[PDB]
Design a binder for this molecule. Structure first.
Ligand SMILES: NCc1ccc(OCCCc2sc(-c3ccc4c(c3)/C(=N/Nc3nc5ccccc5s3)CCC4)nc2C(=O)O)cc1
Ligand SMILES: NCc1ccc(OCCCc2sc(-c3ccc4c(c3)/C(=N/Nc3nc5ccccc5s3)CCC4)nc2C(=O)O)cc1
Lengths: 146, 144
């Protein structure tokens, strides 16, 4: 690959492994690593226990390569029609993940990077103000971590 | 920062369902699994390399390199590369136990240097990290 490829990919590998090993002993590579792990765990639990009791939002979107942010935003808003809470933000991440998997399942690989940018924009415009006034991601970790 | 959370979660989720956000996605997961296996099954059978390093704030790369060399004294193989990562992880946990969290980024830098200098040329000739995945990744499905 390109000149720095090995440098980036080795660093990615080292940080991932060290983050994992520290996490297993109740520590963390960084505060951001603690947030990521808590979100991974919360998303898994949402999918295991709570998701099937709600209507399937992926059915509402019916994503295609012609799909733009505006459609994604309108569907995601349904999650927060009764307001923001941490569980609903968790469902939001899980939704994004399910869309990505579905897109690959259906040979629409182009959507994965698209969805990633959709989510970042939705977070910044719609969820960050609530996050900052509700203790930040550090509070999420205290409530959802382990 | 919100982007960093998005990227991590999507990548974790995709790998869970068999897909790769980036080239290292399947490698990270196989390495995590291989490391757990090594620690559970193997580690107790070798001499503890962390005892030889006795890491302190004064420890530099040279000391780390001299100790890790013992792992590869009979050559490189994937098993020893797994042990190498496990070793790095153990030094990091040990550093935090001893309230020396500052050492963690230094150990990570040491690992990247050793990996590039001493391990990567072997990895590149032995089919890259995808080969590690082929051999050490979960192949229970293919076996079925
Ligand atoms: N102890 C660890 C833990 C982890 C996760 C937990 O989640 C609890 C449920 C979170 C939600 S989700 C929610 C909500 C509100 C409105 C709507 C929804 C959900 C809807 N969800 N539909 C979805 N369909 C999909 C499809 C794929 C992936 C995610 C989703 S979410 C459709 C209708 C609109 N409302 C809430 C809530 O608690 O208020 C709890 C505990
Ligand atoms: N199915 C998935 C899977 C995953 C891992 C596997 O590993 C097999 C053993 C790996 C090693 S380790 C090894 C070796 C060779 C020379 C030495 C050592 C190990 C030594 N290890 N000492 C260590 N002390 C520590 C302390 C903490 C963490 C890691 C270590 S490793 C010290 C003496 C010199 N030589 C080998 C080898 O296979 O040749 C196999 C299968």
């Amino acid at each position: 690959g390109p000149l720095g490829s090995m440098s980036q990919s080795n660093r990615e590998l080292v940080v991932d492994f060290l983050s994992y090993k520290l996490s297993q002993k109740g520590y963390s590579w960084s505060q951001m690593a603690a947030v990521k792990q808590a979100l991974r765990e919360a998303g898994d639990e949402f999918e295991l226990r709570y998701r099937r009791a709600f209507s399937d939002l992926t059915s509402q979107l019916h994503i295609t390569p012609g799909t733009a942010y505006q459609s994604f935003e309108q569907v995601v808003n349904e999650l927060f029609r009764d307001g923001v809470n941490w569980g609903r933000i968790v469902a939001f991440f899980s939704f994004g993940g399910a869309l990505c998997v579905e897109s690959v399942d259906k040979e629409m690989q182009v959507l994965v990077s698209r969805i990633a940018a959709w989510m970042a924009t939705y977070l910044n415009d719609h969820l960050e103000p609530w996050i900052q006034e509700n203790g930040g991601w550090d509070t999420f970790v205290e409530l959802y971590g382990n």
